Amino acid sequence: VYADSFVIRGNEVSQIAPGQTGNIADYNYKLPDDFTGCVIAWNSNKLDS
Amino acid sequence: RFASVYAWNRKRISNCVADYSVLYNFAPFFAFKCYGVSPTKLNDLCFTN
Numbered sequence: 693v694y695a696d697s698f699v700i701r702g703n704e705v706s707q708i709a710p711g712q713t714g715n716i717a718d719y720n721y722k723l724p725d726d727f728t729g730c731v732i733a734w735n736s737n738k739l740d741s
Numbered sequence: 742r743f744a745s746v747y748a749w750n751r752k753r754i755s756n757c758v759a760d761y762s763v764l765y766n767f768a769p770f771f772a773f774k775c776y777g778v779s780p781t782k783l784n785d786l787c788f789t790n
Contacts, residue, residue, distance in 0.1 A: 719756075
């Protein structure tokens with residue numbers, strides 16, 4: 693198994709998907725059409741700001 | 742000013758060559774969702790109006 697960890701704004705979390713839109717899914721990261729895994733997120737505004 | 746939804750406006754576009762890349766120069770698009778056409782391939786199709 694793999695792992696990619698990062699803190700990023702939570703208003704664009706929907707961009708994390710195969711063939712999604714927005715900067716996260718176009719110009720900053722991308723997932724292929726063969727992704728078989730999971731995505732996890734949790735609030736980090738208070739801890740890191 | 743932008744007319745409100747209760748009285749919507751409408752303008753046609755034709756008789757001109759169009760380039761949507763300069764469209765990115767105005768402001769970052771929040772959604773930019775294209776339903777029937779691939780957004781990447783908006784620059785190779787010839788339309789009527």
